[PDB]
Design a protein around this nucleic acid. Structure first.
Ligand SMILES: N[C@@H](Cc1c[nH]c2ccccc12)C(=O)O
Ligand SMILES: [K+]
Ligand SMILES: [K+]
Ligand SMILES: [K+]
Ligand SMILES: [K+]
Ligand SMILES: [K+]
Ligand SMILES: [K+]
Ligand SMILES: [K+]
Ligand SMILES: [K+]
Ligand SMILES: [K+]
Ligand SMILES: [K+]
Ligand SMILES: [K+]
Ligand SMILES: [K+]
Ligand SMILES: [K+]
Ligand SMILES: [K+]
Ligand SMILES: [K+]
Ligand SMILES: [K+]
Ligand SMILES: [K+]
Ligand SMILES: [K+]
Ligand SMILES: [K+]
Ligand SMILES: [K+]
Ligand SMILES: [K+]
Ligand SMILES: [K+]
Ligand SMILES: [K+]
Ligand SMILES: [K+]
Ligand SMILES: [K+]
Ligand SMILES: [K+]
Ligand SMILES: [K+]
Ligand SMILES: [K+]
Ligand SMILES: [K+]
Ligand SMILES: [K+]
Ligand SMILES: [K+]
Ligand SMILES: [K+]
Ligand SMILES: [K+]
Ligand SMILES: [Mg+2]
Ligand SMILES: [Mg+2]
Ligand SMILES: [Mg+2]
Ligand SMILES: [Mg+2]
Ligand SMILES: [Mg+2]
Ligand SMILES: [Mg+2]
Ligand SMILES: [Mg+2]
Ligand SMILES: [Mg+2]
Ligand SMILES: [Mg+2]
Ligand SMILES: [Mg+2]
Ligand SMILES: [Mg+2]
Ligand SMILES: [Mg+2]
Ligand SMILES: [Mg+2]
Ligand SMILES: [Mg+2]
Ligand SMILES: [Mg+2]
Ligand SMILES: [Mg+2]
Ligand SMILES: [Mg+2]
Ligand SMILES: [Mg+2]
Ligand SMILES: [Mg+2]
Ligand SMILES: [Mg+2]
Ligand SMILES: [Mg+2]
Ligand SMILES: [Mg+2]
Ligand SMILES: [Mg+2]
Ligand SMILES: [Mg+2]
Ligand SMILES: [Mg+2]
Ligand SMILES: [Mg+2]
Ligand SMILES: [Mg+2]
Ligand SMILES: [Mg+2]
Ligand SMILES: [Mg+2]
Ligand SMILES: [Mg+2]
Ligand SMILES: [Mg+2]
Ligand SMILES: [Mg+2]
Ligand SMILES: [Mg+2]
Ligand SMILES: [Mg+2]
Ligand SMILES: [Mg+2]
Ligand SMILES: [Mg+2]
Ligand SMILES: [Mg+2]
Ligand SMILES: [Mg+2]
Ligand SMILES: [Mg+2]
Ligand SMILES: [Mg+2]
Ligand SMILES: [Mg+2]
Ligand SMILES: [Mg+2]
Ligand SMILES: [Mg+2]
Ligand SMILES: [Mg+2]
Ligand SMILES: [Mg+2]
Ligand SMILES: [Mg+2]
Ligand SMILES: [Mg+2]
Ligand SMILES: [Mg+2]
Ligand SMILES: [Mg+2]
Ligand SMILES: [Mg+2]
Ligand SMILES: [Mg+2]
Ligand SMILES: [Mg+2]
Ligand SMILES: [Mg+2]
Ligand SMILES: [Mg+2]
Ligand SMILES: [Mg+2]
Ligand SMILES: [Mg+2]
Ligand SMILES: [Mg+2]
Ligand SMILES: [Mg+2]
Ligand SMILES: [Mg+2]
Ligand SMILES: [Mg+2]
Ligand SMILES: [Mg+2]
Ligand SMILES: [Mg+2]
Ligand SMILES: [Mg+2]
Ligand SMILES: [Mg+2]
Ligand SMILES: [Mg+2]
Ligand SMILES: [Mg+2]
Lengths: 123, 209, 114, 56, 118, 17
RNA sequence: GAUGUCGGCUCAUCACAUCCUGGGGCUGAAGUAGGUCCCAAGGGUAUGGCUGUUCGCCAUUUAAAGUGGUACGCGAGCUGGGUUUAGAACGUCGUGAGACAGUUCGGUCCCUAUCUGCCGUGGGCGCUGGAGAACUGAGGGGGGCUGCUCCUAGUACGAGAGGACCGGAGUGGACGCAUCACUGGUGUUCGGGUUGUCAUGCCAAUGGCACUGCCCGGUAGCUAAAUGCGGAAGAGAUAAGUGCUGAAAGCAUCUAAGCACGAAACUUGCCCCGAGAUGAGUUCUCCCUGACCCUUUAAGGGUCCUGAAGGAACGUUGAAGACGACGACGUUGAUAGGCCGGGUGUGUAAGCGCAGCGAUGCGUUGAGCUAACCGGUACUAAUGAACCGUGAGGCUUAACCU
RNA sequence: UUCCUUGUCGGGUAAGUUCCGACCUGCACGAAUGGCGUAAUGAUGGCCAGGCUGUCUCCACCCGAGACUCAGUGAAAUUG
RNA sequence: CAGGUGGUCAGGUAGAGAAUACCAAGGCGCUUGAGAGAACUCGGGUGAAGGAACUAGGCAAAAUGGUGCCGUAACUUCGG
RNA sequence: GAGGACCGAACCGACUAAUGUUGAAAAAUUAGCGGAUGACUUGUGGCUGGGGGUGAAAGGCCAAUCAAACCGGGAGAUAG
C-alpha cells in the first residue's frame, strides 16, 4: 500500500538508501501500489560513490510492504518495512546487481525474473 | 427457467485440494410445493406459484387455508411466483427440489438487504466530507449546496439526499454454483448474497452469460 | 446453525498438534514453482493464535536475512502440510505483539521446561 | 427563517387534524374482584389475574 | 445502527449505571419487592438473578465474588443463607414483574418487581 | 435596547463598497 | 425604507462549436502513426511545486486531462487568503490636515424553515357487499467508462527500419451494488497488568475515584483497507456514409416508384419502484341466507335480535425502526429474560500447602471468570375476555336458463 | 521602498510568483521626521528541516450531552 | 442570571508546594422528568497502510514534559 | 545574596482555537497562553468638569453614551 510521499527503503546495491514515491503508475486516480507494482520515485539519500545520486527521478518496483500480500487460501505475508528495487526509466530493468532481504512470489513474471534469481529467499 | 425459494443459513469456506479457499453462502432449499398454475386463457400469462417451509396452524387465516386446501398442499411460510418459459410444464401439487440446479453453473440470488435506517449523505451516497478543521462551522458532514440560484430556482427531482437506506429488494447476478447437495437440501454459491441470516432468498438461473 | 457446523466438521484436519504463544514452530507449506511441487519450511515464534474451528489461524514471526517477516497461516488449509514444535516458550500473554518493537537479546523468550 | 404571510385559521386546523387523542378501549374485569383495570396491569385494589399480588 | 446489541443506556454513563443497579439489587434482596420504572425493572433481572445462582453453592470464593458485586455484607449473608436455599431447585426465573400505574410526577410507566416465593 | 450586532458589524453591513 | 464581492470547499445540472471512447469521406493515406471534414452528448474526462489567486509556468501521469451557460451556478451550505472601515510603517505627492487599481504587518461572517421545491416515512378517504393473499404492467428511475498483455502474426504492407485491419482470450484502473467466510479497525457492557489515595475492624482479598486513571489483549454487531458481483451479448428503427435495380433525361444516376446495409446516440434487452394507472385492472380463497314499525314511498328512517371472515388494541419482541410503519410470537407457546450445555476471549483465580530471611516462585491448575454468539429448556412474563367490522350487496341494456 | 517584474544569476525542491546569497538598470534609499551593523530578548513577520500526528488520501467504530417519542410548563423575529 | 466582589482561618497521605490526585471537619447533588438509542451538531476515546500529500498558513490535534549525573556548537556587549 | 534576573500557583492580564450569537452572559465559557519583587497589584478616602479634564498617544477614556458627556431650557430651531 504505497502512495505518493511514501518513503521506501532500497533493497538493492545501486547506491540509494531512501526513496520517495512521487507517482503510482498505471491508470488515472490510481491510489495504491502493492507488491509488484511500478512506481515513479525520487532519491532522497544515497551513498557517496553509488551508481545513482541524490535527486534522480527513476522507476522502481515494490517488493516488500508492511501491509503485506494475500494468498489464495487466505494467508498473509507481512514485513517490517517497505522496500523497492530501482529500475531504468526506459527499459525498466534493475540497476543494481544484488538483492537484499526476502522477496515474494508476486514478482514471478517475465518482467522481474532477474530479481527473483538474485534474491536470497523467495517467500 | 424457473427458480427456487431458499433461506440464507450463513457463510463458510470450502477448501480446494490446490489450496484455494472459496467463500460460500449456504442456502437451505427445501422442497417447493406448486400451489397454482396460471395460463393464458384464465390469467393472460404463464407462471407457477410455489410455497415452502411450514406454518403454525393457528396463524393460518381461513382465506389462506382454503387456497392451500384447493391445491392439496400444506401451508408454507408464504407464496412466490415464477414466470414460465414456453415448453416448461408443471401441475398443482408437484414438488420441486434443489436438484433442479444440478447442471446450472451460475445463478441469480434475490433478497432483501439489511436495514440501516435513516442514513446521511456520506454513508448513503458516498459524499465527501468537508474540512474537520481550518475554521469550519458546524458543517463537517452536511451535504453542501443543493442547487443553483434564480435559474432554475428549485431543486431537481432525484437529488441525492439523506433518507432511508437498505431494507429493499436487491439482486446479485452471476454467482458460481459450488455444490448442490440434495440429501440435506443445500446449495453452495460462491460469494455474498443480500440479507441477514435466516432471510428468504429467491434463486434463479443467470439471465446473462 | 447445526447445518454450517456440520459442513465445517467434515473439512477440519484431525492431527494438528498442540502449541501455544511463545513456542518455536516449523511449518511446511506447499509451493508450486511452475509445474513441480515442493515443501519449504517457515520457522519462527508463534505470536498469536485464533481458535475458530475451521477458521482457525496462527501468526508466526521470524527474522530472515535481516528483515522481520510475519506470516498468518490458515490452520486447516491444505497448503499447510505439517506443523511441528521445536521449543516451548514461557509467556504470560496470549498475543506477543510487543515482540515487534524488540529484537536481538531483548526479544528472547524463556523456555517453559514443564 | 420566518413566514412571509400569516397562515389562516383553516391551515391551522388542517395541521391539527392528527392531534386527536384516542381513548382506551380495553378495560378488563378482574375475575375475582370485578374491578376494571388496564390489561396486563394490576388493579387499584392490588389484584392481578385473580390473586392478591401486593398487600397494600 | 443497533443490530443484535443488548443492554440499555438509560440516559446515564457507564459508572452511574453500574452503581445504580448495585443499589437496586441490594434493595430487592433486602425488601423482596420494590417499585421502579418498567425499563429499569427489566434490566434488573440481568443483575439479581445471576447473583441468586451464584449463591446456590456456598464457598469462600463465591462469597467474595458476591461481595465484589454488591459491596454489602448484609446482602451477601441473606443471599447465601436464605435466598440460595429457597431457590435451590428452581431453574432461573427468580423474579416477577407486575405492571402498575403511571407515575404522577412525570407519567413514567411503573412496575413492581418481586421474588417468586415472597 | 441596542440593535442586533450583525446590523452593527462593518464586515456584514458594509458589504458593497 | 440593501439583490453580500474574487478565489477555494461541497454538491451539481444543461448545451454541443467533441478532449477520449464509437461510425464515416478525402488525403501530397504503403504499413505504424497522422492531417482535414462529416455524424454522434451514452459514459468518462489528473495529482502535485509556486502564488490569495482565476489564469499561467513547471514536475510527473492518463484513453483523455473538452469548450461554454446556469446572479462570471452554489456564503438563510462552509471558509475568509485577496479586495473593502477604524491601528501602524515605507516609497511618492502635498506647506498641511491627508492621499495613492502602489506596497507592507494586524483586523467580530447572524437566522429555531411558514410556503414552493427536494429526500424519506405515515394517517384519511376512494376504487360500489366485506375480507386475506398472489399478480399484470400504463408509466418512472438506475446502469452504460476504459487500459495493458497474449494469440491470430513478425502474417498483410514495406528496399530496410518498422509493423497492422478483422476476430478471440486473459488480467488491471476508476466507479457502483451487496456482504462479514477470510485479513483488519472499533469494541467506556469481557479478561488481565499496574501508579496514587480512600473505604470495607485488621492481614489476605476486593470496591470507589483519578480522561475508561494509565495501559495490554478481545466476543457479538457495525465496518474498509477485506472479497463476491456488475457495465455486456442480442434484437428493432436510424445518423453521416455505402449500395442494388431504375426512369424522368434512348446515356448516366443510391431515388422519383421499389429493395439492402450502417454507430457507445433512439426503442428494447439487464436491475429497482409501480393500479390514487380516479382509465383506480386481473386471478385465487374465505364470510354473512333474522323480525317489526313509521314517514315525506325511496339507493328512506328507526327499534329488537344477531356480530361472521377479518382487523385493531394490549402484551413478549426483532438482523425492522426517529415516531408511525414492517416482521415474529402470546400457553394448542421457544417471543424476550433467566437457567443448562457448548463455544469464544483473557491467561494458571481464591483458599490451602511447599521453598525462600524477604520480594517472590512452584503445586493444586490451562485454573477462574467470561457481553451482544450457538444448541437446548416453560422457571418468569406474554390473561378468560372486551372493542371495531354485519346480516347476501343499485339501476339500464344485451347474451343465456327458465 | 522596485512600476516594468515571477528582472538576471546561484542555493534549496521531482517541480519554488514565497525564502536565502549576489548583481545594480535605486520608476521613486541615504545619514538624529537618523544611515549601516548588532549579542540577548519577542503570545512579532517570512522561509526550511527533524519528530509527531484523522490535517489529509478516506473515513470507520465507540462513550456522553442535544436532536426523536411521552407527561408538565411554555416564547420569538415576521405577517396586505 | 455559568459574570464581578476586600480581609481572616489553613487538617491527613503522596508532593518542592497554598500546584495536583484521593480524603477529614463541614457542606452539597446545581427546582422539569421518563423513554428511545436515526440523520446531523456539540464534548471526548481509539484506529490498518501512508505521514502535511490538507491548507492562505501544520489552524486544530498529536507529540515533548521530572530528579540526579555525563555532555553540549556558531556567535557574543564575556553576563550569555 | 544583587537583579524593571529565571521556572512556576494565588493575583493581574488577554495571544490562538472551538462553542455561543432571539446567549448561562448587551463581550462570557472551555482548552491552551503572557507577567508574576515590580515602570507590579489591590482596599478605603480625596482632587482634576465639557472646547474642559485625563491620556507610556489608540481621538483612547470621562457611569453599557464620546472628532466634543448627560439633564433642563431658547424650542413647535430650520428642513427648496
Ligand atoms: N457577536 C458577538 C460579539 C459582539 C457583541 N456586540 C457586537 C457588535 C458588533 C459586532 C459584534 C459584536 C456577540 O454577540 O457576543
Ligand atoms: K455508499
Ligand atoms: K459546468
Ligand atoms: K448537434
Ligand atoms: K476522440
Ligand atoms: K479520418
Ligand atoms: K457523450
Ligand atoms: K496571473
Ligand atoms: K464566497
Ligand atoms: K438567499
Ligand atoms: K458568512
Ligand atoms: K410560496
Ligand atoms: K437512461
Ligand atoms: K479478527
Ligand atoms: K470484530
Ligand atoms: K484501588
Ligand atoms: K488501553
Ligand atoms: K445506377
Ligand atoms: K464499452
Ligand atoms: K386497483
Ligand atoms: K491459586
Ligand atoms: K479458559
Ligand atoms: K522606492
Ligand atoms: K537546484
Ligand atoms: K532552482
Ligand atoms: K539600529
Ligand atoms: K510579541
Ligand atoms: K525573528
Ligand atoms: K434515537
Ligand atoms: K536573589
Ligand atoms: K523571595
Ligand atoms: K495604594
Ligand atoms: K462639549
Ligand atoms: K448615565
Ligand atoms: Mg429510515
Ligand atoms: Mg461562529
Ligand atoms: Mg465543529
Ligand atoms: Mg418557474
Ligand atoms: Mg433526557
Ligand atoms: Mg471513572
Ligand atoms: Mg423592501
Ligand atoms: Mg456536432
Ligand atoms: Mg513544502
Ligand atoms: Mg458567482
Ligand atoms: Mg445563497
Ligand atoms: Mg482569519
Ligand atoms: Mg483578511
Ligand atoms: Mg489609518
Ligand atoms: Mg481605492
Ligand atoms: Mg485579533
Ligand atoms: Mg454561517
Ligand atoms: Mg411546516
Ligand atoms: Mg417498467
Ligand atoms: Mg429506461
Ligand atoms: Mg483484531
Ligand atoms: Mg487493534
Ligand atoms: Mg480496547
Ligand atoms: Mg492489603
Ligand atoms: Mg469516594
Ligand atoms: Mg472526590
Ligand atoms: Mg462474527
Ligand atoms: Mg389491486
Ligand atoms: Mg419445546
Ligand atoms: Mg531561484
Ligand atoms: Mg504556500
Ligand atoms: Mg535578497
Ligand atoms: Mg526614509
Ligand atoms: Mg527622506
Ligand atoms: Mg534629517
Ligand atoms: Mg539592520
Ligand atoms: Mg513584552
Ligand atoms: Mg411536549
Ligand atoms: Mg407576538
Ligand atoms: Mg416588521
Ligand atoms: Mg450567581
Ligand atoms: Mg478576588
Ligand atoms: Mg486544588
Ligand atoms: Mg463530613
Ligand atoms: Mg425497544
Ligand atoms: Mg449518540
Ligand atoms: Mg492511523
Ligand atoms: Mg500504525
Ligand atoms: Mg502543500
Ligand atoms: Mg492542495
Ligand atoms: Mg497549534
Ligand atoms: Mg552548529
Ligand atoms: Mg561563556
Ligand atoms: Mg554560561
Ligand atoms: Mg522577573
Ligand atoms: Mg488593558
Ligand atoms: Mg482568550
Ligand atoms: Mg482561560
Ligand atoms: Mg512563560
Ligand atoms: Mg513566571
Ligand atoms: Mg500565570
Ligand atoms: Mg516600583
Ligand atoms: Mg463608556
Ligand atoms: Mg460642537
Ligand atoms: Mg421640529
Ligand atoms: Mg426661537
Amino acid at each position: 500500500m504505497i502512495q505518493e510521499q511514501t518513503m521506501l527503503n532500497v533493497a538493492d546495491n545501486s547506491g540509494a538508501r531512501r526513496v520517495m514515491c512521487i507517482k503510482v503508475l498505471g491508470g488515472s486516480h490510481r491510489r495504491y501500489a502493492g507488491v509488484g507494482d511500478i512506481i515513479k520515485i525520487t532519491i532522497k539519500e544515497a551513498i557517496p560513490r553509488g551508481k545513482v545520486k541524490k535527486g534522480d527521478v527513476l522507476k522502481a518496483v515494490v517488493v516488500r510492504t508492511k501491509k503485506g500480500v494475500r494468498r489464495p487460501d487466505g494467508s498473509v505475508i507481512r514485513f517490517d518495512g517497505n522496500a523497492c528495487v530501482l529500475l531504468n526509466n526506459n527499459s525498466e530493468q534493475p540497476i543494481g546487481t544484488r538483492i537484499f532481504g526476502p522477496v515474494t512470489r508476486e514478482l514471478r513474471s517475465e518482467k522481474f525474473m532477474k530479481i527473483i534469481s538474485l534474491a536470497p529467499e523467495v517467500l | 427457467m424457473i427458480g427456487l425459494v431458499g433461506k440464507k443459513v450463513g457463510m463458510t469456506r470450502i477448501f480446494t485440494e490446490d489450496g484455494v479457499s472459496i467463500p460460500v453462502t449456504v442456502i437451505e432449499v427445501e422442497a417447493n410445493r406448486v400451489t397454482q398454475v396460471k395460463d393464458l386463457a384464465n390469467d393472460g400469462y404463464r407462471a407457477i406459484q410455489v410455497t415452502t417451509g411450514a406454518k403454525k396452524a393457528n396463524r393460518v387465516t381461513k382465506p389462506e387455508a382454503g387456497h392451500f386446501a384447493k391445491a392439496g398442499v400444506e401451508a408454507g411460510r408464504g407464496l412466490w411466483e415464477f414466470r414460465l418459459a414456453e415448453g416448461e410444464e408443471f401441475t398443482v401439487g408437484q414438488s420441486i427440489s434443489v436438484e433442479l440446479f444440478a447442471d446450472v453453473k451460475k445463478v441469480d440470488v434475490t433478497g432483501t438487504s439489511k436495514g440501516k435506517g435513516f442514513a446521511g449523505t456520506v454513508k448513503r451516497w458516498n459524499f465527501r466530507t468537508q474540512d474537520a478543521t481550518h475554521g469550519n462551522s458546524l458543517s463537517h458532514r452536511v451535504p453542501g449546496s443543493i442547487g443553483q440560484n434564480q435559474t432554475p430556482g428549485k431543486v431537481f427531482k432525484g437529488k441525492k439526499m439523506a433518507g432511508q437506506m437498505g431494507n429493499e429488494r436487491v439482486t446479485v447476478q452471476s454467482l458460481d454454483v459450488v455444490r448442490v447437495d440434495a440429501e440435506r437440501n443445500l446449495l453452495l454459491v460462491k460469494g455474498a448474497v443480500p440479507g441477514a441470516t435466516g432471510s428468504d432468498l429467491i434463486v434463479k438461473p443467470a439471465v446473462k452469460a | 446453525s447445526n447445518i454450517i457446523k456440520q459442513l465445517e466438521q467434515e473439512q477440519m484436519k484431525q492431527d494438528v498438534p498442540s502449541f501455544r504463544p511463545g513456542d518455536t514452530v516449523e511449518v511446511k507449506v506447499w509451493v508450486v514453482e511452475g509445474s513441480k511441487k515442493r515443501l519449504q519450511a517457515f520457522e519462527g515464534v508463534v505470536i498469536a493464535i485464533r481458535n475458530r474451528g475451521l477458521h482457525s489461524a496462527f501468526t508466526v514471526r521470524k527474522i530472515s536475512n535481516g528483515e522481520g517477516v510475519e506470516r498468518v497461516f490458515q490452520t486447516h488449509s491444505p497448503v499447510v502440510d505439517s506443523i511441528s514444535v521445536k521449543r516451548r516458550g514461557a509467556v504470560r500473554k496470549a498475543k506477543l505483539y510487543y515482540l515487534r518493537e524488540r529484537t536481538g537479546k531483548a526479544a528472547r523468550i524463556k523456555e517453559r521446561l514443564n | 427563517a420566518v413566514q412571509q404571510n400569516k397562515p389562516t385559521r383553516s391551515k391551522r386546523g388542517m395541521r391539527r387534524s392528527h392531534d386527536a387523542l384516542t381513548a382506551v378501549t380495553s378495560l378488563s374485569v378482574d375475575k375475582t374482584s370485578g374491578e376494571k383495570h388496564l390489561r396486563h396491569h394490576i388493579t387499584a385494589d392490588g389484584y392481578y389475574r385473580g390473586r392478591k399480588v401486593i398487600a397494600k | 445502527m443497533r443490530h443484535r446489541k443488548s443492554g440499555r443506556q438509560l440516559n446515564r454513563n457507564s459508572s452511574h449505571r453500574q452503581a445504580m443497579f448495585r443499589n437496586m439489587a441490594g434493595s430487592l434482596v433486602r425488601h423482596e419487592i420494590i417499585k421502579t420504572t418498567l425499563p429499569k425493572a427489566k434490566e434488573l433481572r440481568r443483575v439479581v438473578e445471576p447473583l441468586i445462582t451464584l449463591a446456590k453453592t456456598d464457598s469462600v470464593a463465591n462469597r467474595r465474588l458476591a461481595f465484589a458485586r454488591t459491596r454489602d455484607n448484609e446482602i451477601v449473608a441473606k443471599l447465601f443463607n436464605e435466598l440460595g436455599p429457597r431457590f435451590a431447585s428452581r431453574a432461573g426465573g427468580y423474579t416477577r414483574i407486575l405492571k402498575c400505574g403511571f407515575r404522577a410526577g412525570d407519567n413514567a410507566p411503573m412496575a413492581y418487581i418481586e421474588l417468586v416465593d415472597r | 435596547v441596542t440593535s442586533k450586532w450583525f446590523n452593527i458589524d462593518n464586515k456584514i453591513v458594509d458589504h458593497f463598497p
